[PDB]
Amino acid sequence: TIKVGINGFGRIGRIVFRAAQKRSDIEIVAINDLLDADYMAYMLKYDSTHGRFDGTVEVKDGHLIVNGKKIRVTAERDPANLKWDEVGVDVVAEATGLFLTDETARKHITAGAKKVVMTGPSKDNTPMFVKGANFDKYAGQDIVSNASCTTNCLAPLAKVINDNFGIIEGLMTTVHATTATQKTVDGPSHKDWRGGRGASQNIIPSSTGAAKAVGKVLPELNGKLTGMAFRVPTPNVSVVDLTVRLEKAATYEQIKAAVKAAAEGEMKGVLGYTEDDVVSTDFNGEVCTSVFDAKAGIALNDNFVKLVSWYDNETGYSNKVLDLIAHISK
Amino acid sequence: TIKVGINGFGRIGRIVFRAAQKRSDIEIVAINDLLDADYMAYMLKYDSTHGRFDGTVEVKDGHLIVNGKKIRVTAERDPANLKWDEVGVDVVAEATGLFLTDETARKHITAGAKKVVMTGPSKDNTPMFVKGANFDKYAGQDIVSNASCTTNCLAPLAKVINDNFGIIEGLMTTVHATTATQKTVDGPSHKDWRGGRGASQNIIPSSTGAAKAVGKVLPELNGKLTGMAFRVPTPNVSVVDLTVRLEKAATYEQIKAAVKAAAEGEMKGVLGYTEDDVVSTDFNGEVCTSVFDAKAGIALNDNFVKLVSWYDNETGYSNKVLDLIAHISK
Numbered sequence A, B: 001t002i003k004v005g006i007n008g009f010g011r012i013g014r015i016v017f018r019a020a021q022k023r024s025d026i027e028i029v030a031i032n033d034l035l036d037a038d039y040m041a042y043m044l045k046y047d048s049t050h051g052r053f054d055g056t057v058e059v060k061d062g063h064l065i066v067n068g069k070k071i072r073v074t075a076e077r078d079p080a081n082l083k084w085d086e087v088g089v090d091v092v093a094e095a096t097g098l099f100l101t102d103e104t105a106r107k108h109i110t111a112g113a114k115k116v117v118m119t120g121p122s123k124d125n126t127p128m129f130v131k132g133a134n135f136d137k138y139a140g141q142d143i144v145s146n147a148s149c150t151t152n153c154l155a156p157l158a159k160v161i162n163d164n165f166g167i168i169e170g171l172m173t174t175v176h177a178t179t180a181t182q183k184t185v186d187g188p189s190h191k192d193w194r195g196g197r198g199a200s201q202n203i204i205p206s207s208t209g210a211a212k213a214v215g216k217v218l219p220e221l222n223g224k225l226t227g228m229a230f231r232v233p234t235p236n237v238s239v240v241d242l243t244v245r246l247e248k249a250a251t252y253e254q255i256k257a258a259v260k261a262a263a264e265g266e267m268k269g270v271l272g273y274t275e276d277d278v279v280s281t282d283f284n285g286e287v288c289t290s291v292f293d294a295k296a297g298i299a300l301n302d303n304f305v306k307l308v309s310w311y312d313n314e315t316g317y318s319n320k321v322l323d324l325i326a327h328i329s330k
């Protein structure tokens, strides 16, 4: 079993942990964040979006004890001092979002850890990997990125489409749920003015970390597609609205069959396919990082079409993070 | 002064009323709906979305008295006998969403009125007009349709883009604010299953008139444009996301200037232009039916671009309905 230390107990860190309990090839042994087991335990037992924790939580002498296993609670401001080797961690889930560079991220290895998987897109040229898109392209690296929730949604869908009909070009839009980096009411957001406005009252045009981030994970589509985001007042689960020009002509029924096929074989678990009259809440807790909404998309003609695909920016992403850990760990 | 009577005191009927108060060419003289002057006055005095009515509203003698002028309230489940001529109404603002056909709408002329403006996409062949797109094409028709709010936002923008660069093909998406037609919690919606789900908890894939309803008002784009909608948890103000491929290459600066020009010239008051860091609430009360969002849009290449335009689905459309009344009136 793989030992993993989580740096950052924010939204991602807490769900990465939850999703993990259900596994076997992985085990969280340490959690580091500027919070005490006491409070840290509380943010685990209660969740406004996903419900109460499924197991047991106890704080025994400065440390966590979930479902029996004892977790090591720390609070280091500087990674280097994490003394990860002590608790003996194989790979680190870097989820504080502060160390997205190799320079900074390496401080984990130095601290006794073998490899580090950033739970967000890298700020430098550190490799990025998205399950179902380029996982099989992993080259032993000891520091990697799992991109962003949107790229994880857009990448797989864009792949099967390109692979089957060839994408001449395409533009996207993701109707994004509210994240923690937004404000409850009109407040300060210097580098992002729009994103400072009341999150619950507005539709806020944003930018997305999946624009051409997909152009990196899937080089074949580099420079062939960008996008944006429209942050709306929901707590979780977003959706990508992809408009593409196809090389080989294809009927909508043809596109449906192509993704459904992928969702059932090659990309099973990553890509999903549905024909039901679904809405955002129906994907709360969804493990697939991209669930095709057959009935939603529209084709103008055989070479111009709009495809829709859901994703739980929390549950899907976090699950594939553990998947990336288990991969580089292979 | 044109004498107008409103049939249906819903969201539209009420905002149309408020807007008209500012005018000098039009006057509301009667209002029909299954509500009394009491309840009817109350819904005019207070509005969760637009604030308290600015002016005097008193219900003396079973009839409204707004800012002095006495309005005649009624309640006729059947328009056939509204006795419109007693009050001397020229044009009827058909805003019940009930009689969207010639026959049904005709009952308004049969009842004493001269012309009738349907405040919604017509179900039969009644011609639809959208200010800024084809108001010029009016041929005296006694019964007309002002299309829907999303068409009023899309039509103008599409025209200036088509006109200047020529739209080969295009697909849209409108992130729509909640409407009275939706349910507060998961409920019954026989014809629209997705639309019955909790309005405030979901991003709900939908369908939209504007789609090819634009192919009608704007004949040249017939079959070249279609789209959808995503109903989000906001009270008012939506936004169209138009992805089009141009015949004539155009840099984004060129598209900015063409739109800004239209807004400052031939389409002043219909098409609006902005370069600020705006969000939805910034357009609550907005009178233009299509405000271009410069910074939000994005160009992939000189022939494939995504354009963004805002609109107050209530205020904008309502104002133009009156603009249409005055048109066929002249």
Ligand SMILES: *[C@@H](O)[C@H](O)COP(=O)(O)O
Binding pocket: A147, A148, A149, A150, A151, A174, A176, A179, A207, A208, A209, A210, A229, A313, A317
């Ligand atoms: C998921 O990683 C975040 O909540 C949203 O970021 P994107 O760049 O839009 O995917």
Ligand SMILES: *[C@@H](O)[C@H](O)COP(=O)(O)O
Binding pocket: B148, B149, B150, B151, B174, B176, B179, B207, B208, B209, B210, B229, B313, B314, B317
């Ligand atoms: C404005 O007429 C309505 O609130 C929305 O209808 P659409 O068909 O989306 O324009």
